[PDB]
Amino acid sequence: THLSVDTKFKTEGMTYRRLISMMGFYPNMFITREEAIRHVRAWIGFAVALPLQLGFSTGVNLVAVPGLPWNVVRIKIVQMLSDTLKNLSDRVVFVLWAHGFELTSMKYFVKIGPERTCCLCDRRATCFSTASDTYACWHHSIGFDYVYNPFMIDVQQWGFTGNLQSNHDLYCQVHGNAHVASCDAIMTRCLAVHECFVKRVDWTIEYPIIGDELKINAACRKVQHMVVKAALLADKFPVLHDIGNPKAIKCVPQADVEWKFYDAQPCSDKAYKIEELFYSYATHSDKFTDGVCLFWNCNVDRYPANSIVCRFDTRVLSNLNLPGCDGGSLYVNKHAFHTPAFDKSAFVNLKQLPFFYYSDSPCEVPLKSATCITRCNLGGAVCRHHANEYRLYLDAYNMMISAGFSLWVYKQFDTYNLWNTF
C-alpha cells in the first residue's frame, strides 16, 4: 500500500507524522522507494540554500525575500512544473536530500488536502488558485499560484553515510557543484536515478503510454528482423551471440543458425537458456570470435568487430527520454532503461549500417531504387507487393531514426552478397 506516517525518519539530516506538523500542516506526502520508481516521470529534484534561494533539477533558480515576491515566486513554480510535467505525469515527486530548510519552505508554495479533480477535466488536481478557490491539473493551471498534493522522498532515508556531494560523485562525473540550490537538486535526482535504475532493468514495472511508444517499438522490431535476417543470408554465420537478451526470444525464429543468449540479468523463467555474462571489451575482446554478436540496445563500453548493434542516442529530446546519471539518460518506454552516454569511441571497430529493403518472398508510380533488393528489381521493374512493403519499411526505418536509434555493423557487411541470394 502506502508509507505509514508511523515510520521513523532518520534525523541526521521522530516519524513522518511529526515531520509534517513541523513543516506547517493521500495518507502521507512521503512515498516509498517502490512508489517513487513507478512515478519516475514525476521526479523534480528540490533543494534550498532571510531571503531563500529555491532550486530545481530543471536548472531553474528563484530567490524570494521577506530577490522576488513570494506571490510571484509561487506563480513561476506552478508554471515551470506545469510546463515540465503536463505530458509526463499526473503528479510531481520532489526528490530531496533533506537538510530541514527545504521542508520548511514548502508551506509558502504547497497546499495539501484530500485527492481532488481539475475544474476543467477528469485529471487529478496538481494546482490550486487562492484567487478563485479552484483546482487544476498541469494542463489547466494557467493562473494558478499553489502546488496541490505534491509527493516527495528523502534520498538520505535510503541509508547514505557522507554528504550529497561525496555520494553523487561516486557514480557521476558530469554534475559539478557550482555552489547553488539547482546543482544540489540536479545531483540529488541523479543519485536517486543511480540507486533506482542503473544496476538492472525491473521487468515487472511497466509505464503508461504517453507518446508514440507502440509505433516506435513496432518499427524497431521490423528493422531488427530485416537487418539480422539480411546479415545471416549475406555472411552465412554458423553462430549468433545475442548479448543482452534476458527472455531468450530470437528476432528471426526461422534462421538456420545456432542462436546463443547472454545477459547480465537473465529472467528466472528462461535462465536455463541464457548465460549470465557482463560484457566489457577489456574482459571479452578475445571472446565470441566465431559467427556474429547481436547487441540490440546492449550498451557496452566498446563493441567487437563482428557485431550488429542498435544504440539509442541519449542526447535525443523526447517525453520518453529523461535526464540520467553520468551523461546517460533514463529512456522510459514500456519499462525504464538507464542508457549510458552516447560515445562514438564505442563504434570504432564498426561502420554505420546503410539503408536497404531485402525480400526473398514471392513477387505480386514506378520505383527506381538501388536499395530495393528484390527478385523483380534485379529484372528491370519492381512488383506492386515489394514496392508497397518497401515504402512501409522506409516509413519504419525513418520512425526508428527520428526516435533516436542508430544502426552499426561489422566493416565487411555489403548488400552485394544479398544480390547473390536470388
Ligand X SMILES: Nc1ncnc2c1ncn2[C@@H]1O[C@H](CSCC[C@H](N)C(=O)O)[C@@H](O)[C@H]1O
Ligand Y SMILES: Cc1c(S(=O)(=O)N2CCc3[nH]ncc3C2)cc(C(=O)NCc2c(F)ccc3occc23)n1C
Rounded Cα distance between 403 and 318, Å, is 8
Contact present, 404 and 390 (Cβ < 8 Å): no
Which residue number places its CB atom closest to ligand X?
244
Instruction: For residue 283, give Cα distances in angstroms to 142, 179, 259, 351, 384.
Output: 55, 39, 22, 23, 50
Contact between 383 and Zn ion per CB under 5 A: yes
Contact between 199 and ligand Y per CB under 6 A: no
Strands (E), 190-291: 239-243, 258-263, 274-276
Contact present, 33 and 153 (Cβ < 8 Å): yes
243 binds, among Zn ion, ligand Y, ligand X, none (CB under 5 to 8 A by kind): ligand X
Of the residues 53, 105, 265, 369, which one makes contact with ligand X according to CB under 6 A: 265
172 binds, among ligand X, ligand Y, Zn ion, none (CB under 5 to 8 A by kind): Zn ion
Which stretch, 36-44, 87-95, 107-115, 136-144, contacts Zn ion (CB under 5 A)? Answer: 136-144
Instruction: Give whichever of 301 and 414 is closer to ligand Y, judged by the CB atom.
Output: 301
Rounded Cα distance between 244 and 275, Å, is 10
For Zn ion, how many residues bind (rule: CB under 5 A)? 15
Rounded Cα distance between 212 and 222, Å, is 16
Instruction: Give whichever of 80 and 401 is closer to ligand X, judged by the CB atom.
Output: 401
Contact between 218 and ligand Y per CB under 6 A: no
Q: For 357, phi and psi rounded to 5 degrees?
A: -115, 130
Rounded Cα distance between 136 and 131, Å, is 13
Cell matching residue 418: 544479398
Query: 247: helix, coil or strand?
Result: coil
Of the residues 42, 219, 228, 300, which one makes contact with ligand X according to CB under 6 A: 300
Instruction: Give whichever of 180 and 201 is closer to ligand X, judged by the CB atom.
Output: 201
Closest approach, Cβ 6 to ligand X, in A, equals: 37
Contact present, 313 and 300 (Cβ < 8 Å): no
Closest approach, Cβ 208 to Zn ion, in A, equals: 17
Closest approach, Cβ 5 to ligand Y, in A, equals: 36
Name the site residues for Zn ion (rule: CB under 5 A).
118, 120-121, 123, 137, 139-140, 172, 175, 190, 363, 374, 376, 383, 386
